[PDB]
Swiss-Prot record:
The N-terminus is blocked. This is Ras GTPase-activating protein 1. Interacts with SQSTM1. Interacts with SPSB1; the interaction does not promote degradation. Interacts with CAV2 (tyrosine phosphorylated form). Directly interacts with NCK1. Interacts with PDGFRB (tyrosine phosphorylated). Interacts (via SH2 domain) with the 'Tyr-9' phosphorylated form of PDPK1. Interacts with tyrosine-phosphorylated EPHB4. Residues 1-60 form the SH3 domain. It is found in: Cytoplasm. The gene is RASA1. It is linked to Mutations in the SH2 domain of RASA seem to be oncogenic and cause basal cell carcinomas.
Length: 60
């Protein structure tokens, strides 16, 4: 469980558990699979869903 920040914007694929986001959006990473899929909470929108880890950076 950690925070990550979007380094790019993203528009979700319709009728999926993906969420949209903007560059700079902060997320709580609840869980992550080996293939890069994360279940997160977007802290700006309070939406939960799927994101790919290559669109985010570790928060230090
Ligand atoms: Cl949708």
């Amino acid at each position: 469980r950690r925070r990550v920040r979007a380094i790019l914007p993203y528009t979700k694929v319709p009728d999926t558990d993906e969420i949209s986001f903007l560059k700079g959006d902060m997320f709580i990473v609840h869980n992550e699979l080996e293939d890069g899929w994360m279940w997160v909470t977007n802290l700006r929108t309070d939406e939960q869903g799927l994101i790919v880890e290559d669109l985010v950076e570790e928060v230090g």
